PDB file of N, CA, C and O in Angstrom:
ATOM      1  N   UNK M   1       1.664  -2.361 -18.656  1.00 53.24           N
ATOM      2  CA  UNK M   1       0.790  -3.306 -17.943  1.00 53.24           C
ATOM      3  C   UNK M   1      -0.466  -2.458 -17.259  1.00 53.24           C
ATOM      4  O   UNK M   1      -0.453  -1.318 -16.273  1.00 53.24           O
ATOM      5  N   UNK M   2      -1.561  -3.689 -17.144  1.00 57.25           N
ATOM      6  CA  UNK M   2      -3.198  -2.984 -16.006  1.00 57.25           C
ATOM      7  C   UNK M   2      -2.545  -2.396 -14.912  1.00 57.25           C
ATOM      8  O   UNK M   2      -1.187  -3.805 -14.504  1.00 57.25           O
ATOM      9  N   UNK M   3      -2.998  -2.195 -13.896  1.00 58.40           N
ATOM     10  CA  UNK M   3      -2.791  -2.352 -12.823  1.00 58.40           C
ATOM     11  C   UNK M   3      -2.936  -3.277 -12.029  1.00 58.40           C
ATOM     12  O   UNK M   3      -4.841  -3.202 -11.473  1.00 58.40           O
ATOM     13  N   UNK M   4      -2.884  -4.767 -12.169  1.00 58.86           N
ATOM     14  CA  UNK M   4      -3.488  -5.650 -11.804  1.00 58.86           C
ATOM     15  C   UNK M   4      -1.687  -6.565 -10.853  1.00 58.86           C
ATOM     16  O   UNK M   4      -0.934  -6.143 -11.787  1.00 58.86           O
ATOM     17  N   UNK M   5      -1.859  -7.377 -10.531  1.00 58.37           N
ATOM     18  CA  UNK M   5      -0.471  -8.353 -10.512  1.00 58.37           C
ATOM     19  C   UNK M   5      -0.376  -8.934 -11.877  1.00 58.37           C
ATOM     20  O   UNK M   5      -1.643  -9.847 -12.802  1.00 58.37           O
ATOM     21  N   UNK M   6       0.428  -8.550 -12.927  1.00 55.88           N
ATOM     22  CA  UNK M   6       1.003  -8.577 -14.454  1.00 55.88           C
ATOM     23  C   UNK M   6       0.955 -10.266 -14.794  1.00 55.88           C
ATOM     24  O   UNK M   6       2.172 -10.418 -15.235  1.00 55.88           O
ATOM     25  N   UNK M   7       0.819 -11.060 -13.528  1.00 54.93           N
ATOM     26  CA  UNK M   7       0.414 -13.069 -13.830  1.00 54.93           C
ATOM     27  C   UNK M   7       2.179 -12.793 -12.844  1.00 54.93           C
ATOM     28  O   UNK M   7       2.842 -14.060 -12.963  1.00 54.93           O
ATOM     29  N   UNK M   8       2.787 -11.309 -12.483  1.00 54.90           N
ATOM     30  CA  UNK M   8       4.249 -11.869 -11.619  1.00 54.90           C
ATOM     31  C   UNK M   8       3.910 -12.335 -10.155  1.00 54.90           C
ATOM     32  O   UNK M   8       4.314 -12.831  -9.138  1.00 54.90           O
ATOM     33  N   UNK M   9       2.725 -12.848  -9.998  1.00 51.11           N
ATOM     34  CA  UNK M   9       1.854 -12.601  -8.623  1.00 51.11           C
ATOM     35  C   UNK M   9       2.364 -11.503  -7.847  1.00 51.11           C
ATOM     36  O   UNK M   9       2.879 -11.887  -6.137  1.00 51.11           O
ATOM     37  N   UNK M  10       2.123 -10.660  -7.934  1.00 50.74           N
ATOM     38  CA  UNK M  10       2.630  -9.433  -7.244  1.00 50.74           C
ATOM     39  C   UNK M  10       1.220  -8.468  -7.362  1.00 50.74           C
ATOM     40  O   UNK M  10       0.749  -7.847  -8.581  1.00 50.74           O
ATOM     41  N   UNK M  11       0.612  -8.228  -6.100  1.00 47.77           N
ATOM     42  CA  UNK M  11      -0.728  -7.429  -5.704  1.00 47.77           C
ATOM     43  C   UNK M  11       0.373  -5.675  -6.343  1.00 47.77           C
ATOM     44  O   UNK M  11       0.836  -5.807  -6.066  1.00 47.77           O
ATOM     45  N   UNK M  12      -0.913  -5.382  -6.151  1.00 45.93           N
ATOM     46  CA  UNK M  12      -1.053  -3.540  -6.480  1.00 45.93           C
ATOM     47  C   UNK M  12       0.333  -3.503  -6.166  1.00 45.93           C
ATOM     48  O   UNK M  12       0.316  -2.530  -5.012  1.00 45.93           O
ATOM     49  N   UNK M  13       1.429  -3.013  -6.879  1.00 45.47           N
ATOM     50  CA  UNK M  13       2.516  -2.259  -6.913  1.00 45.47           C
ATOM     51  C   UNK M  13       2.890  -1.315  -6.790  1.00 45.47           C
ATOM     52  O   UNK M  13       3.196  -0.459  -5.936  1.00 45.47           O
ATOM     53  N   UNK M  14       2.507   0.139  -7.805  1.00 42.00           N
ATOM     54  CA  UNK M  14       2.499   1.137  -8.390  1.00 42.00           C
ATOM     55  C   UNK M  14       3.808   1.089  -8.093  1.00 42.00           C
ATOM     56  O   UNK M  14       5.244   0.384  -7.958  1.00 42.00           O
ATOM     57  N   UNK M  15       4.145   3.035  -7.814  1.00 39.22           N
ATOM     58  CA  UNK M  15       5.814   3.229  -8.163  1.00 39.22           C
ATOM     59  C   UNK M  15       5.939   3.606  -9.318  1.00 39.22           C
ATOM     60  O   UNK M  15       5.965   4.390 -10.268  1.00 39.22           O
ATOM     61  N   UNK M  16       5.904   2.439  -9.941  1.00 40.93           N
ATOM     62  CA  UNK M  16       5.892   2.119 -11.648  1.00 40.93           C
ATOM     63  C   UNK M  16       4.791   2.952 -12.387  1.00 40.93           C
ATOM     64  O   UNK M  16       5.100   3.355 -13.378  1.00 40.93           O
ATOM     65  N   UNK M  17       4.065   2.771 -11.688  1.00 41.04           N
ATOM     66  CA  UNK M  17       2.698   3.264 -12.198  1.00 41.04           C
ATOM     67  C   UNK M  17       1.868   4.617 -11.548  1.00 41.04           C
ATOM     68  O   UNK M  17       1.741   5.100 -12.150  1.00 41.04           O
ATOM     69  N   UNK M  18       2.267   4.626  -9.502  1.00 39.45           N
ATOM     70  CA  UNK M  18       1.816   6.089  -9.465  1.00 39.45           C
ATOM     71  C   UNK M  18       2.976   6.966  -8.808  1.00 39.45           C
ATOM     72  O   UNK M  18       4.247   6.992  -9.618  1.00 39.45           O
ATOM     73  N   UNK M  19       3.372   6.202  -7.686  1.00 43.07           N
ATOM     74  CA  UNK M  19       2.446   5.665  -6.802  1.00 43.07           C
ATOM     75  C   UNK M  19       1.426   6.377  -6.782  1.00 43.07           C
ATOM     76  O   UNK M  19       1.033   7.491  -6.698  1.00 43.07           O
ATOM     77  N   UNK M  20       0.587   5.182  -6.874  1.00 40.98           N
ATOM     78  CA  UNK M  20      -0.579   5.568  -6.470  1.00 40.98           C
ATOM     79  C   UNK M  20      -1.192   5.518  -4.938  1.00 40.98           C
ATOM     80  O   UNK M  20      -0.484   5.482  -4.518  1.00 40.98           O
ATOM     81  N   UNK M  21      -2.065   7.049  -4.929  1.00 39.48           N
ATOM     82  CA  UNK M  21      -3.064   6.947  -3.417  1.00 39.48           C
ATOM     83  C   UNK M  21      -3.801   5.348  -3.218  1.00 39.48           C
ATOM     84  O   UNK M  21      -4.161   5.084  -4.275  1.00 39.48           O
ATOM     85  N   UNK M  22      -4.132   5.378  -2.446  1.00 41.00           N
ATOM     86  CA  UNK M  22      -4.698   4.065  -2.669  1.00 41.00           C
ATOM     87  C   UNK M  22      -6.068   4.577  -1.077  1.00 41.00           C
ATOM     88  O   UNK M  22      -4.717   4.496   0.501  1.00 41.00           O
ATOM     89  N   UNK M  23      -6.866   4.444  -1.343  1.00 38.76           N
ATOM     90  CA  UNK M  23      -7.808   3.910   0.262  1.00 38.76           C
ATOM     91  C   UNK M  23      -8.126   2.754   0.978  1.00 38.76           C
ATOM     92  O   UNK M  23      -8.725   2.131   0.415  1.00 38.76           O
ATOM     93  N   UNK M  24      -7.137   3.260   1.913  1.00 36.81           N
ATOM     94  CA  UNK M  24      -6.743   1.820   2.744  1.00 36.81           C
ATOM     95  C   UNK M  24      -8.777   1.545   3.209  1.00 36.81           C
ATOM     96  O   UNK M  24      -9.157   2.202   3.431  1.00 36.81           O
ATOM     97  N   UNK M  25      -8.757   0.418   3.219  1.00 39.70           N
ATOM     98  CA  UNK M  25     -10.481  -0.328   3.664  1.00 39.70           C
ATOM     99  C   UNK M  25     -10.245  -0.652   4.640  1.00 39.70           C
ATOM    100  O   UNK M  25     -11.187  -1.595   5.372  1.00 39.70           O
ATOM    101  N   UNK M  26      -9.062  -1.394   5.187  1.00 40.10           N
ATOM    102  CA  UNK M  26      -8.401  -2.496   6.584  1.00 40.10           C
ATOM    103  C   UNK M  26      -7.028  -1.552   6.734  1.00 40.10           C
ATOM    104  O   UNK M  26      -6.346  -3.353   5.972  1.00 40.10           O
ATOM    105  N   UNK M  27      -6.938  -1.389   7.493  1.00 39.76           N
ATOM    106  CA  UNK M  27      -5.947  -1.235   8.671  1.00 39.76           C
ATOM    107  C   UNK M  27      -5.937  -1.418   9.220  1.00 39.76           C
ATOM    108  O   UNK M  27      -6.852  -1.232   9.794  1.00 39.76           O
ATOM    109  N   UNK M  28      -4.416  -1.889  10.646  1.00 38.87           N
ATOM    110  CA  UNK M  28      -4.490  -1.549  11.226  1.00 38.87           C
ATOM    111  C   UNK M  28      -3.780  -0.599  11.732  1.00 38.87           C
ATOM    112  O   UNK M  28      -3.350   1.096  11.331  1.00 38.87           O
ATOM    113  N   UNK M  29      -3.760   0.486  13.363  1.00 38.16           N
ATOM    114  CA  UNK M  29      -3.151   1.337  13.653  1.00 38.16           C
ATOM    115  C   UNK M  29      -1.880   0.851  14.361  1.00 38.16           C
ATOM    116  O   UNK M  29      -1.908   0.191  15.470  1.00 38.16           O
ATOM    117  N   UNK M  30      -0.766   0.369  13.387  1.00 37.92           N
ATOM    118  CA  UNK M  30       0.659  -0.220  14.529  1.00 37.92           C
ATOM    119  C   UNK M  30       1.245   1.424  14.260  1.00 37.92           C
ATOM    120  O   UNK M  30       0.854   2.328  14.624  1.00 37.92           O
ATOM    121  N   UNK M  31       2.665   0.866  13.451  1.00 35.37           N
ATOM    122  CA  UNK M  31       3.753   1.868  13.432  1.00 35.37           C
ATOM    123  C   UNK M  31       4.736   1.410  12.660  1.00 35.37           C
ATOM    124  O   UNK M  31       4.868   0.717  12.272  1.00 35.37           O
ATOM    125  N   UNK M  32       5.972   2.091  12.281  1.00 35.47           N
ATOM    126  CA  UNK M  32       6.673   1.556  11.884  1.00 35.47           C
ATOM    127  C   UNK M  32       7.883   0.461  12.815  1.00 35.47           C
ATOM    128  O   UNK M  32       9.165   0.750  12.795  1.00 35.47           O
ATOM    129  N   UNK M  33       7.437   0.870  14.272  1.00 36.07           N
ATOM    130  CA  UNK M  33       7.958   0.311  15.005  1.00 36.07           C
ATOM    131  C   UNK M  33       7.718  -1.215  14.917  1.00 36.07           C
ATOM    132  O   UNK M  33       8.357  -2.533  15.116  1.00 36.07           O
ATOM    133  N   UNK M  34       6.476  -1.091  14.741  1.00 37.62           N
ATOM    134  CA  UNK M  34       6.254  -2.410  14.202  1.00 37.62           C
ATOM    135  C   UNK M  34       6.075  -3.869  12.888  1.00 37.62           C
ATOM    136  O   UNK M  34       5.184  -3.152  12.218  1.00 37.62           O
ATOM    137  N   UNK M  35       7.126  -4.084  13.026  1.00 36.99           N
ATOM    138  CA  UNK M  35       7.063  -4.259  11.501  1.00 36.99           C
ATOM    139  C   UNK M  35       7.280  -3.363  10.446  1.00 36.99           C
ATOM    140  O   UNK M  35       7.615  -4.018   9.398  1.00 36.99           O
ATOM    141  N   UNK M  36       6.992  -2.174  11.007  1.00 34.39           N
ATOM    142  CA  UNK M  36       7.049  -0.843   9.440  1.00 34.39           C
ATOM    143  C   UNK M  36       5.480  -1.304   8.951  1.00 34.39           C
ATOM    144  O   UNK M  36       5.543  -2.037   7.925  1.00 34.39           O
ATOM    145  N   UNK M  37       4.727  -0.725   9.946  1.00 34.89           N
ATOM    146  CA  UNK M  37       3.627  -0.880   9.301  1.00 34.89           C
ATOM    147  C   UNK M  37       3.306   0.449   9.127  1.00 34.89           C
ATOM    148  O   UNK M  37       3.377   1.709  10.019  1.00 34.89           O
ATOM    149  N   UNK M  38       2.073   0.975   8.106  1.00 38.96           N
ATOM    150  CA  UNK M  38       1.176   1.358   8.325  1.00 38.96           C
ATOM    151  C   UNK M  38      -0.296   2.217   9.376  1.00 38.96           C
ATOM    152  O   UNK M  38      -1.293   1.437   9.017  1.00 38.96           O
ATOM    153  N   UNK M  39       0.214   3.222   9.807  1.00 39.13           N
ATOM    154  CA  UNK M  39      -1.324   3.739  10.711  1.00 39.13           C
ATOM    155  C   UNK M  39      -2.454   4.658  10.510  1.00 39.13           C
ATOM    156  O   UNK M  39      -2.094   5.056  10.346  1.00 39.13           O
ATOM    157  N   UNK M  40      -3.144   3.794   9.720  1.00 41.18           N
ATOM    158  CA  UNK M  40      -4.394   4.344   9.117  1.00 41.18           C
ATOM    159  C   UNK M  40      -5.704   3.723   9.160  1.00 41.18           C
ATOM    160  O   UNK M  40      -5.491   1.784   9.658  1.00 41.18           O
ATOM    161  N   UNK M  41      -6.796   4.053   9.208  1.00 41.07           N
ATOM    162  CA  UNK M  41      -7.881   3.701   9.216  1.00 41.07           C
ATOM    163  C   UNK M  41      -8.349   3.124   8.085  1.00 41.07           C
ATOM    164  O   UNK M  41      -8.197   3.267   6.927  1.00 41.07           O
ATOM    165  N   UNK M  42      -9.847   2.126   7.990  1.00 42.46           N
ATOM    166  CA  UNK M  42     -10.641   1.481   6.703  1.00 42.46           C
ATOM    167  C   UNK M  42     -10.806   3.404   6.475  1.00 42.46           C
ATOM    168  O   UNK M  42     -11.918   3.663   7.221  1.00 42.46           O
ATOM    169  N   UNK M  43     -10.986   3.649   5.533  1.00 41.72           N
ATOM    170  CA  UNK M  43     -11.252   4.815   4.655  1.00 41.72           C
ATOM    171  C   UNK M  43     -10.576   6.211   5.029  1.00 41.72           C
ATOM    172  O   UNK M  43     -10.707   6.834   4.195  1.00 41.72           O
ATOM    173  N   UNK M  44      -8.772   5.249   4.633  1.00 42.61           N
ATOM    174  CA  UNK M  44      -8.412   6.285   5.267  1.00 42.61           C
ATOM    175  C   UNK M  44      -7.906   6.127   3.710  1.00 42.61           C
ATOM    176  O   UNK M  44      -7.864   5.580   3.071  1.00 42.61           O
ATOM    177  N   UNK M  45      -6.153   6.216   3.538  1.00 43.11           N
ATOM    178  CA  UNK M  45      -5.546   6.109   2.374  1.00 43.11           C
ATOM    179  C   UNK M  45      -4.375   6.254   2.649  1.00 43.11           C
ATOM    180  O   UNK M  45      -3.745   6.711   3.639  1.00 43.11           O
ATOM    181  N   UNK M  46      -3.422   5.501   2.038  1.00 40.41           N
ATOM    182  CA  UNK M  46      -2.617   4.851   1.611  1.00 40.41           C
ATOM    183  C   UNK M  46      -1.354   4.851   0.563  1.00 40.41           C
ATOM    184  O   UNK M  46      -1.795   4.480  -0.412  1.00 40.41           O
ATOM    185  N   UNK M  47      -0.291   5.297   0.535  1.00 37.89           N
ATOM    186  CA  UNK M  47       0.393   5.550  -1.036  1.00 37.89           C
ATOM    187  C   UNK M  47       1.287   4.542  -1.454  1.00 37.89           C
ATOM    188  O   UNK M  47       2.674   4.601  -0.715  1.00 37.89           O
ATOM    189  N   UNK M  48       1.037   3.782  -2.573  1.00 35.09           N
ATOM    190  CA  UNK M  48       2.260   2.634  -2.206  1.00 35.09           C
ATOM    191  C   UNK M  48       3.171   2.995  -3.098  1.00 35.09           C
ATOM    192  O   UNK M  48       3.167   3.214  -4.546  1.00 35.09           O
ATOM    193  N   UNK M  49       4.183   3.157  -2.821  1.00 36.54           N
ATOM    194  CA  UNK M  49       4.890   4.006  -3.571  1.00 36.54           C
ATOM    195  C   UNK M  49       6.855   2.693  -2.929  1.00 36.54           C
ATOM    196  O   UNK M  49       7.860   3.230  -4.416  1.00 36.54           O
ATOM    197  N   UNK M  50       7.000   1.715  -2.432  1.00 37.28           N
ATOM    198  CA  UNK M  50       7.982   1.435  -2.440  1.00 37.28           C
ATOM    199  C   UNK M  50       7.439  -0.479  -2.923  1.00 37.28           C
ATOM    200  O   UNK M  50       7.177  -1.310  -2.272  1.00 37.28           O
ATOM    201  N   UNK M  51       8.042  -0.284  -4.320  1.00 37.19           N
ATOM    202  CA  UNK M  51       7.974  -1.731  -3.880  1.00 37.19           C
ATOM    203  C   UNK M  51       9.107  -2.481  -4.053  1.00 37.19           C
ATOM    204  O   UNK M  51      10.205  -2.780  -5.022  1.00 37.19           O
ATOM    205  N   UNK M  52       9.035  -3.886  -3.159  1.00 39.01           N
ATOM    206  CA  UNK M  52       9.862  -4.220  -2.501  1.00 39.01           C
ATOM    207  C   UNK M  52       9.372  -6.013  -2.697  1.00 39.01           C
ATOM    208  O   UNK M  52       8.344  -6.010  -3.282  1.00 39.01           O
ATOM    209  N   UNK M  53       9.825  -6.599  -2.320  1.00 41.49           N
ATOM    210  CA  UNK M  53      10.191  -8.578  -1.884  1.00 41.49           C
ATOM    211  C   UNK M  53       9.668  -8.787  -3.575  1.00 41.49           C
ATOM    212  O   UNK M  53      10.157  -8.523  -4.592  1.00 41.49           O
ATOM    213  N   UNK M  54       8.461  -9.907  -3.020  1.00 41.03           N
ATOM    214  CA  UNK M  54       8.281 -11.155  -4.710  1.00 41.03           C
ATOM    215  C   UNK M  54       6.751 -10.540  -4.639  1.00 41.03           C
ATOM    216  O   UNK M  54       6.429 -11.266  -5.537  1.00 41.03           O
ATOM    217  N   UNK M  55       6.196 -10.217  -3.720  1.00 42.23           N
ATOM    218  CA  UNK M  55       4.895  -9.906  -3.784  1.00 42.23           C
ATOM    219  C   UNK M  55       4.434  -9.090  -3.089  1.00 42.23           C
ATOM    220  O   UNK M  55       3.546  -7.756  -3.626  1.00 42.23           O
ATOM    221  N   UNK M  56       4.464  -8.514  -1.698  1.00 44.41           N
ATOM    222  CA  UNK M  56       3.689  -7.416  -1.298  1.00 44.41           C
ATOM    223  C   UNK M  56       4.817  -6.169  -1.178  1.00 44.41           C
ATOM    224  O   UNK M  56       6.214  -6.236  -0.931  1.00 44.41           O
ATOM    225  N   UNK M  57       3.931  -5.300  -0.581  1.00 44.85           N
ATOM    226  CA  UNK M  57       5.054  -4.036  -0.653  1.00 44.85           C
ATOM    227  C   UNK M  57       4.782  -2.741   0.260  1.00 44.85           C
ATOM    228  O   UNK M  57       3.876  -3.268   1.290  1.00 44.85           O
ATOM    229  N   UNK M  58       5.772  -1.700   0.311  1.00 43.78           N
ATOM    230  CA  UNK M  58       5.865  -0.930   1.506  1.00 43.78           C
ATOM    231  C   UNK M  58       5.192   0.148   0.393  1.00 43.78           C
ATOM    232  O   UNK M  58       5.027   1.209  -0.220  1.00 43.78           O
ATOM    233  N   UNK M  59       3.269   0.407   1.754  1.00 47.37           N
ATOM    234  CA  UNK M  59       3.221   2.028   1.667  1.00 47.37           C
ATOM    235  C   UNK M  59       3.287   2.589   2.645  1.00 47.37           C
ATOM    236  O   UNK M  59       4.181   3.542   3.171  1.00 47.37           O
ATOM    237  N   UNK M  60       2.738   4.412   1.841  1.00 47.18           N
ATOM    238  CA  UNK M  60       4.048   5.404   2.614  1.00 47.18           C
ATOM    239  C   UNK M  60       2.284   6.101   3.137  1.00 47.18           C
ATOM    240  O   UNK M  60       2.136   7.404   1.793  1.00 47.18           O
ATOM    241  N   UNK M  61       1.546   6.851   3.912  1.00 44.69           N
ATOM    242  CA  UNK M  61       0.461   7.563   3.597  1.00 44.69           C
ATOM    243  C   UNK M  61       0.793   8.284   4.576  1.00 44.69           C
ATOM    244  O   UNK M  61       0.510   8.831   5.999  1.00 44.69           O
ATOM    245  N   UNK M  62       1.303   9.562   4.190  1.00 45.12           N
ATOM    246  CA  UNK M  62       1.684  11.073   4.576  1.00 45.12           C
ATOM    247  C   UNK M  62       2.070  11.047   6.362  1.00 45.12           C
ATOM    248  O   UNK M  62       1.852  11.219   7.198  1.00 45.12           O
ATOM    249  N   UNK M  63       3.558  10.009   5.937  1.00 41.97           N
ATOM    250  CA  UNK M  63       3.789   9.733   7.317  1.00 41.97           C
ATOM    251  C   UNK M  63       4.315   8.346   7.479  1.00 41.97           C
ATOM    252  O   UNK M  63       4.784   8.219   8.958  1.00 41.97           O
ATOM    253  N   UNK M  64       3.489   7.352   7.457  1.00 41.69           N
ATOM    254  CA  UNK M  64       3.489   6.191   7.908  1.00 41.69           C
ATOM    255  C   UNK M  64       4.306   5.162   6.918  1.00 41.69           C
ATOM    256  O   UNK M  64       3.125   5.913   5.924  1.00 41.69           O
ATOM    257  N   UNK M  65       4.681   3.987   7.163  1.00 42.36           N
ATOM    258  CA  UNK M  65       5.329   3.409   6.321  1.00 42.36           C
ATOM    259  C   UNK M  65       5.354   2.046   6.747  1.00 42.36           C
ATOM    260  O   UNK M  65       5.224   1.804   8.172  1.00 42.36           O
ATOM    261  N   UNK M  66       4.928   1.286   5.404  1.00 42.76           N
ATOM    262  CA  UNK M  66       4.877  -0.176   6.180  1.00 42.76           C
ATOM    263  C   UNK M  66       4.797  -1.124   5.491  1.00 42.76           C
ATOM    264  O   UNK M  66       3.881  -0.527   4.147  1.00 42.76           O
ATOM    265  N   UNK M  67       4.172  -1.850   5.054  1.00 46.46           N
ATOM    266  CA  UNK M  67       3.712  -2.992   4.494  1.00 46.46           C
ATOM    267  C   UNK M  67       2.462  -3.969   4.825  1.00 46.46           C
ATOM    268  O   UNK M  67       2.281  -3.946   5.485  1.00 46.46           O
ATOM    269  N   UNK M  68       1.885  -4.055   3.569  1.00 48.68           N
ATOM    270  CA  UNK M  68       0.246  -4.636   3.501  1.00 48.68           C
ATOM    271  C   UNK M  68       0.070  -5.093   2.447  1.00 48.68           C
ATOM    272  O   UNK M  68       0.274  -4.342   1.716  1.00 48.68           O
ATOM    273  N   UNK M  69      -0.651  -6.197   2.124  1.00 52.48           N
ATOM    274  CA  UNK M  69      -1.441  -6.866   1.125  1.00 52.48           C
ATOM    275  C   UNK M  69      -2.475  -5.435   0.475  1.00 52.48           C
ATOM    276  O   UNK M  69      -3.034  -4.557   1.289  1.00 52.48           O
ATOM    277  N   UNK M  70      -2.962  -6.018  -0.396  1.00 51.72           N
ATOM    278  CA  UNK M  70      -3.357  -5.729  -1.227  1.00 51.72           C
ATOM    279  C   UNK M  70      -5.411  -5.657  -0.692  1.00 51.72           C
ATOM    280  O   UNK M  70      -6.296  -4.978  -1.295  1.00 51.72           O
ATOM    281  N   UNK M  71      -4.792  -6.273  -0.709  1.00 53.21           N
ATOM    282  CA  UNK M  71      -6.524  -7.647  -0.265  1.00 53.21           C
ATOM    283  C   UNK M  71      -7.464  -5.947   0.765  1.00 53.21           C
ATOM    284  O   UNK M  71      -8.333  -6.558   1.682  1.00 53.21           O
ATOM    285  N   UNK M  72      -6.996  -5.208   1.048  1.00 51.11           N
ATOM    286  CA  UNK M  72      -7.659  -3.947   2.261  1.00 51.11           C
ATOM    287  C   UNK M  72      -7.402  -2.615   2.010  1.00 51.11           C
ATOM    288  O   UNK M  72      -7.006  -1.860   2.767  1.00 51.11           O
ATOM    289  N   UNK M  73      -7.038  -2.652   0.428  1.00 50.58           N
ATOM    290  CA  UNK M  73      -6.935  -0.997  -0.394  1.00 50.58           C
ATOM    291  C   UNK M  73      -7.807  -0.685  -1.743  1.00 50.58           C
ATOM    292  O   UNK M  73      -7.918  -1.977  -2.642  1.00 50.58           O
ATOM    293  N   UNK M  74      -8.158  -0.150  -1.689  1.00 51.27           N
ATOM    294  CA  UNK M  74      -9.231   1.027  -2.824  1.00 51.27           C
ATOM    295  C   UNK M  74      -7.776   1.311  -3.758  1.00 51.27           C
ATOM    296  O   UNK M  74      -7.246   1.736  -2.064  1.00 51.27           O
ATOM    297  N   UNK M  75      -7.740   1.537  -4.776  1.00 48.08           N
ATOM    298  CA  UNK M  75      -6.971   2.846  -5.178  1.00 48.08           C
ATOM    299  C   UNK M  75      -6.824   4.176  -5.392  1.00 48.08           C
ATOM    300  O   UNK M  75      -8.141   4.207  -5.688  1.00 48.08           O
ATOM    301  N   UNK M  76      -6.672   4.712  -5.835  1.00 44.33           N
ATOM    302  CA  UNK M  76      -6.790   6.411  -5.941  1.00 44.33           C
ATOM    303  C   UNK M  76      -5.669   6.432  -7.252  1.00 44.33           C
ATOM    304  O   UNK M  76      -4.907   5.431  -7.540  1.00 44.33           O
ATOM    305  N   UNK M  77      -6.496   7.578  -8.154  1.00 45.07           N
ATOM    306  CA  UNK M  77      -5.030   8.069  -9.454  1.00 45.07           C
ATOM    307  C   UNK M  77      -4.360   9.057  -9.066  1.00 45.07           C
ATOM    308  O   UNK M  77      -4.278  10.352  -9.151  1.00 45.07           O
ATOM    309  N   UNK M  78      -2.793   8.431  -8.305  1.00 44.57           N
ATOM    310  CA  UNK M  78      -1.365   9.289  -7.820  1.00 44.57           C
ATOM    311  C   UNK M  78      -1.468  10.500  -7.209  1.00 44.57           C
ATOM    312  O   UNK M  78      -1.637  10.442  -6.203  1.00 44.57           O
TER     313      UNK M  78
END
């Protein structure tokens, strides 16, 4: 399946696909205390490795972990 929501209403999942690296283009600087969110900036990268929930997933960015829509990541080739 192409890396798109394969009609499952599931944004860029990966792990199954990569996990792909993904260049974040809009993330906050949170922490794992914060909902478990990804501390990174626009232009940084986040690696989506955790396929969970029924829609959005958890990335792991060189030691940040958390969950966040694809609506602000570009991806890379794993």
